[PDB]
Scaffold this motif. Structure first.
Motif, PDB file in Angstrom:
ATOM      1  N   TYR A 187       0.694  -1.497  -0.058  1.00  0.00           N
ATOM      2  CA  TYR A 187      -0.104  -0.675  -0.025  1.00  0.00           C
ATOM      3  C   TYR A 187       0.736   1.607  -0.416  1.00  0.00           C
ATOM      4  O   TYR A 187       0.867   2.195  -0.880  1.00  0.00           O
ATOM      5  CB  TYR A 187      -1.142  -0.178   1.032  1.00  0.00           C
ATOM      6  N   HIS A 188       1.732   1.584   0.974  1.00  0.00           N
ATOM      7  CA  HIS A 188       2.127   2.357   1.054  1.00  0.00           C
ATOM      8  C   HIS A 188       3.407   2.882   0.163  1.00  0.00           C
ATOM      9  O   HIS A 188       5.285   2.974   0.354  1.00  0.00           O
ATOM     10  CB  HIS A 188       2.826   2.609   2.465  1.00  0.00           C
ATOM     11  N   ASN A 189       3.141   2.673  -0.952  1.00  0.00           N
ATOM     12  CA  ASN A 189       4.092   2.524  -2.228  1.00  0.00           C
ATOM     13  C   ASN A 189       3.986   4.551  -3.455  1.00  0.00           C
ATOM     14  O   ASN A 189       3.509   4.688  -2.213  1.00  0.00           O
ATOM     15  CB  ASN A 189       4.526   1.625  -3.291  1.00  0.00           C
ATOM     16  N   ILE A 243     -16.395  -0.434   6.458  1.00  0.00           N
ATOM     17  CA  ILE A 243     -17.478   0.177   7.491  1.00  0.00           C
ATOM     18  C   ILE A 243     -17.393   0.589   8.305  1.00  0.00           C
ATOM     19  O   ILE A 243     -17.765   1.407   8.267  1.00  0.00           O
ATOM     20  CB  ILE A 243     -18.478  -1.069   7.273  1.00  0.00           C
ATOM     21  N   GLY A 244     -16.179   0.297   9.303  1.00  0.00           N
ATOM     22  CA  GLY A 244     -15.982   0.536   9.867  1.00  0.00           C
ATOM     23  C   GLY A 244     -15.414   1.341  10.354  1.00  0.00           C
ATOM     24  O   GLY A 244     -15.438   2.543  10.918  1.00  0.00           O
ATOM     25  N   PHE A 245     -14.135   1.569   9.466  1.00  0.00           N
ATOM     26  CA  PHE A 245     -12.988   2.590   8.752  1.00  0.00           C
ATOM     27  C   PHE A 245     -14.227   4.092   8.605  1.00  0.00           C
ATOM     28  O   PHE A 245     -14.078   5.123   8.562  1.00  0.00           O
ATOM     29  CB  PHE A 245     -12.301   2.299   8.152  1.00  0.00           C
ATOM     30  N   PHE A 289     -16.344   4.870  11.823  1.00  0.00           N
ATOM     31  CA  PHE A 289     -15.274   5.653  12.583  1.00  0.00           C
ATOM     32  C   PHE A 289     -14.514   6.476  12.232  1.00  0.00           C
ATOM     33  O   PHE A 289     -14.396   7.401  12.837  1.00  0.00           O
ATOM     34  CB  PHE A 289     -14.642   4.333  13.536  1.00  0.00           C
ATOM     35  N   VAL A 290     -14.075   6.524  11.341  1.00  0.00           N
ATOM     36  CA  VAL A 290     -13.052   7.307  10.643  1.00  0.00           C
ATOM     37  C   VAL A 290     -13.405   8.300   9.723  1.00  0.00           C
ATOM     38  O   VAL A 290     -13.538  10.016  10.241  1.00  0.00           O
ATOM     39  CB  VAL A 290     -11.903   6.807  10.634  1.00  0.00           C
ATOM     40  N   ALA A 291     -13.799   8.175   8.424  1.00  0.00           N
ATOM     41  CA  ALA A 291     -13.935   8.747   7.235  1.00  0.00           C
ATOM     42  C   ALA A 291     -15.145   9.350   7.113  1.00  0.00           C
ATOM     43  O   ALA A 291     -14.925  11.409   6.681  1.00  0.00           O
ATOM     44  CB  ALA A 291     -14.143   8.223   6.032  1.00  0.00           C
TER      45      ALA A 291
HETATM   46  C1  E8H Z   1      -8.423   1.151   2.079  1.00  0.00           C
HETATM   47  O1  E8H Z   1      -9.192   1.300   3.208  1.00  0.00           O
HETATM   48  C2  E8H Z   1      -7.470   2.206   4.522  1.00  0.00           C
HETATM   49  C3  E8H Z   1      -6.459   2.202   4.012  1.00  0.00           C
HETATM   50  C4  E8H Z   1      -5.786   3.886   4.926  1.00  0.00           C
HETATM   51  C5  E8H Z   1      -5.797   3.440   6.628  1.00  0.00           C
HETATM   52  C6  E8H Z   1      -5.423   3.761   7.465  1.00  0.00           C
HETATM   53  N1  E8H Z   1      -5.941   3.616   8.722  1.00  0.00           N
HETATM   54  N2  E8H Z   1      -4.639   4.168   9.867  1.00  0.00           N
HETATM   55  C7  E8H Z   1      -5.167   3.849  10.970  1.00  0.00           C
HETATM   56  C8  E8H Z   1      -5.502   2.714  11.134  1.00  0.00           C
HETATM   57  C9  E8H Z   1      -6.152   2.066  12.788  1.00  0.00           C
HETATM   58  N3  E8H Z   1      -7.762   3.533  12.606  1.00  0.00           N
HETATM   59  C10 E8H Z   1      -8.885   2.834  13.203  1.00  0.00           C
HETATM   60  O2  E8H Z   1      -8.663   1.438  13.640  1.00  0.00           O
HETATM   61  C11 E8H Z   1      -9.828   3.457  13.243  1.00  0.00           C
HETATM   62  N4  E8H Z   1     -10.773   2.130  13.535  1.00  0.00           N
HETATM   63  C12 E8H Z   1     -11.941   2.347  14.602  1.00  0.00           C
HETATM   64  O3  E8H Z   1     -11.884   2.886  15.713  1.00  0.00           O
HETATM   65  C13 E8H Z   1     -13.046   1.580  13.569  1.00  0.00           C
HETATM   66  C14 E8H Z   1     -12.864   0.999  13.181  1.00  0.00           C
HETATM   67  C15 E8H Z   1     -11.252   1.502  12.681  1.00  0.00           C
HETATM   68  O4  E8H Z   1     -11.145   1.816  11.034  1.00  0.00           O
HETATM   69  C16 E8H Z   1      -7.448   4.576  12.665  1.00  0.00           C
HETATM   70  C17 E8H Z   1      -6.831   5.066  11.162  1.00  0.00           C
HETATM   71  C18 E8H Z   1      -3.666   4.274   9.356  1.00  0.00           C
HETATM   72  O5  E8H Z   1      -2.498   4.934  10.914  1.00  0.00           O
HETATM   73  C19 E8H Z   1      -3.381   4.652   7.909  1.00  0.00           C
HETATM   74  C20 E8H Z   1      -2.015   5.513   7.899  1.00  0.00           C
HETATM   75  C21 E8H Z   1      -2.123   6.986   7.685  1.00  0.00           C
HETATM   76  C22 E8H Z   1      -3.873   7.357   7.853  1.00  0.00           C
HETATM   77  C23 E8H Z   1      -4.514   6.018   7.052  1.00  0.00           C
HETATM   78  C24 E8H Z   1      -3.833   4.899   6.809  1.00  0.00           C
HETATM   79  C25 E8H Z   1      -7.361   2.965   6.474  1.00  0.00           C
HETATM   80  C26 E8H Z   1      -8.453   1.742   5.948  1.00  0.00           C
HETATM   81  O6  E8H Z   1      -8.934   0.866   5.724  1.00  0.00           O
HETATM   82  C27 E8H Z   1      -9.026  -0.021   7.241  1.00  0.00           C
END
Ligand code: E8H
Ligand code: MG
Ligand code: ZN
Length: 333
Positions: A83-85, A290-292, A295-297
């Motif tokens: 991914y981080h390429n 869906i969680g992402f 909870f985040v986006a």
């Molecule tokens: C394409 O899909 C994704 C792309 C990037 C990231 C990143 N993620 N992250 C954190 C991971 C931990 N986090 C969480 O677990 C948040 N969260 C909950 O609390 C419930 C479920 C959930 O997802 C915060 C973001 C990073 O740090 C990566 C590096 C920089 C930016 C985004 C990246 C996550 C993706 O899909 C899960």
């Protein structure tokens, strides 16, 4: 750092990219990568085309050759991880272009600041090894020790800024060489700030600060401009879920494999392995996304659009439709 050769530039300049509109929000970098024998060249050509088309390098005395040297100097420092390429940072560059120009965010910034954002996108993950900040700290890695010792836990973000400053210290790859005085200072400081702001541990405080500024008509202008920049880079960093479904799903596969490789390495070393990084959980792609989204986006894009960035509404719309699509995957399983 070793100078970019002419043959290296010619390989990028050879790419015509027929049929692709690099300025479009539905532009498909995966299809671009498939289109050719040489995906790394095509990726560089997209970045090059975006930068030249903006009108911005020309305005700040950055020549065509220096711009392409810089791009190729960034490319040399990305690794072959899932991914981080270099495709991730070209994607963040292209996406930020769309937020600035299709989303009208350019209206809130100077052209220097727009120029800086587009360049910062390309430096923001330099030399990422497919391992997050927490891995370095949990394993007591040399890199992690130095961070603790020196008092900044953003292990990789500080690392990325250090390689960015290296590329820019040679005039042949300094896209800011045409600047001096307070402007050149602002270009370096805002670039560095933006990259430091991509540490997801700081995600909530960055958001609250932007939102608080945006609601305050007496906010310091410089501060708001800076926070906007930081927010747009952050937005690009988590913009996967705002693309059309198959593009969005391909990014999710790429990050899932990357996380898994981290968890396999953590297992070996005897450190805590989280659920999202564990192959044995085989967590569904739809639930993870869906969680992402929940909870985040979705909260992030919704809040920044309502506060200030109304032209970016399409990102909220698309998150909604992608969430519904993942819910269909569950429903029919
Ligand atoms: C394409 O899909 C994704 C792309 C990037 C990231 C990143 N993620 N992250 C954190 C991971 C931990 N986090 C969480 O677990 C948040 N969260 C909950 O609390 C419930 C479920 C959930 O997802 C915060 C973001 C990073 O740090 C990566 C590096 C920089 C930016 C985004 C990246 C996550 C993706 O899909 C899960
Ligand atoms: Mg990063
Ligand atoms: Zn990133």
């Amino acid at each position: 750092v070793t100078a970019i050769t002419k043959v290296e530039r010619e390989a990028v300049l050879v790419c015509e990219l027929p049929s692709f509109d690099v300025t479009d929000v539905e532009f498909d970098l995966f299809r671009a990568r498939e289109s050719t024998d040489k995906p790394l060249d095509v990726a560089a050509a997209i970045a090059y085309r975006l930068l030249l088309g903006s009108g911005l390098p020309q305005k700040f005395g950055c020549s065509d050759e220096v711009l392409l040297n810089f791009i190729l100097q960034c490319r040399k420092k990305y690794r072959n991880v899932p991914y981080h390429n270099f495709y991730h940072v070209v994607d963040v560059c292209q996406t930020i272009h769309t937020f600035l120009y299709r989303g009208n965010v350019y209206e809130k910034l100077t052209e220097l600041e727009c120029f800086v954002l587009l360049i910062t996108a390309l430096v923001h993950d330099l030399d990422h090894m497919g391992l997050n900040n927490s891995f370095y700290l949990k394993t007591e890695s040399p890199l992690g020790i130095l961070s603790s010792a020196s008092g900044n836990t953003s292990v990789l973000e500080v690392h990325h800024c250090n390689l960015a400053v290296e590329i820019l210290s040679d005039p042949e790859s300094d896209v800011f060489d045409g600047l001096e005085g307070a402007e050149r200072t602002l270009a370096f400081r805002s670039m560095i700030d933006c990259v430091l702001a991509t540490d997801m541990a700081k995600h909530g405080s960055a958001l609250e600060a932007f939102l608080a500024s945006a609601a305050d008509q007496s906010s310091d202008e410089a501060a708001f401009h800076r926070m906007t920049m930081e927010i747009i880079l952050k937005a690009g960093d988590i913009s996967n879920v705002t693309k059309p479904f198959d593009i969005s799903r391909q990014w999710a596969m790429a990050v899932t494999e990357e996380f898994y490789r981290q968890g396999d390495m953590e297992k070996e070393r005897g450190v805590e392995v989280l659920p999202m990084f564990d192959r044995s959980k085989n967590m569904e792609l739809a639930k993870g996304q869906i969680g992402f989204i929940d909870f985040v986006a979705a909260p992030f894009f919704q809040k920044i659009v309502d506060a200030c960035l109304q032209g970016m509404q399409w990102t909220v719309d698309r998150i909604k439709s992608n969430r519904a699509q993942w819910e269909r995957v569950l429903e029919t399983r």
